[PDB]
């Protein structure tokens, strides 16, 4: 069902949800619950929410055309966090740490 490149991507997904990175990955596991957090303007500012559970749903449903589309969704997750938050926010620090893991593994993708 999966190309060599999308298997590599599924392995990155597994890595990003693994306990090793939980200290900083956890705000990305589920969709941002704007009402529960009191972020009443989140969905006015962030037009296309993304999180690791959405990515995992897509991967399980074979919805990614290619590894580039997978990378676009993971990068959107991070970009939404940088767009909504100020630069010194604790969740932005977490996003940068998780994104370092993502980009490094993504770069080792096979030809
Ligand atoms: C638990 O998982 C997540 C995941 C997240 O993204 C992946 C976010 C995220 O993007 N932003 C925030 C967030 C941001 C701000 C500015 C904030 O403060 C509003 C009121 N403050 C007092 C008055 C001035 C501002 C609050 C409470 C939460 N929380 C998240 C939690």
UniProtKB/Swiss-Prot annotation:
Effect of substituting residue 37 to A: Reduced binding to histone H4 acetylated at 'Lys-12' (H4K12ac)
Highest taxon in the source lineage: Eukaryota
Residue intervals of the Bromo domain: 1-109
Consequence the record notes for mutating residue 85 to A: Abolished binding to histone H4 acetylated at 'Lys-12' (H4K12ac)
Locations listed in the record: Nucleus; Chromosome
Coiled-coil spans in chain: none
Similarity comment: family membership: Belongs to the BET family.
Misc remark: Some specific inhibitors of BRD2 that prevent binding to acetylated histone are promising therapeutic molecules for the treatment of cancers or inflammatory diseases. ABBV-744, a small molecule, has been tested on tumors with success: ABBV-744 antiproliferative activity is mainly restricted to cell lines of acute myeloid leukaemia and prostate cancer and is able to displace BRD4 from chromatin. GSK046 (iBET-BD2), which specifically inhibits the second bromo domain, is a promising therapeutic small molecule for the treatment of inflammatory and autoimmune diseases.
Subunit field text: Homodimer. Interacts with E2F1. Interacts with (acetylated) STAT3; promoting STAT3 recruitment to chromatin. Interacts with CTCF; promoting BRD2 recruitment to chromatin. (Microbial infection) Interacts with herpes virus 8 protein LANA1.
Its job: Chromatin reader protein that specifically recognizes and binds histone H4 acetylated at 'Lys-5' and 'Lys-12' (H4K5ac and H4K12ac, respectively), thereby controlling gene expression and remodeling chromatin structures. Recruits transcription factors and coactivators to target gene sites, and activates RNA polymerase II machinery for transcriptional elongation.
Recorded domain comment: The first bromo domain specifically recognizes histone H4 acetylated at 'Lys-12' (H4K12ac). It also specifically binds histone H4 acetyl-methylated at 'Lys-5' and 'Lys-12' (H4K5acme and H4K12acme, respectively). The second bromo domain recognizes and binds histone H4 acetylated at 'Lys-5' and 'Lys-12' (H4K5ac and H4K12ac, respectively).
Name assigned to this protein: Bromodomain-containing protein 2
Organism: Homo sapiens (Human)
């Amino acid at each position: 069902k999966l190309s060599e490149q999308l298997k590599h991507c599924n392995g990155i997904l597994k890595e990003l949800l693994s306990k090793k990175h939980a200290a900083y990955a956890w705000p990305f596991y589920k969709p941002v619950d704007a009402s529960a957090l009191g972020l009443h303007d989140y969905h006015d500012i962030i037009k296309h929410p993304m999180d690791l559970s959405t990515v995992k749903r897509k991967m399980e449903n074979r919805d990614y055309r290619d590894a580039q589309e997978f990378a676009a969704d993971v990068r959107l997750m991070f970009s939404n966090c940088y767009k909504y938050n100020p630069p010194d926010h604790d969740v932005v620090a977490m996003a940068r740490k998780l994104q370092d893991v993502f980009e490094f593994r993504y770069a080792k993708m096979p030809d």
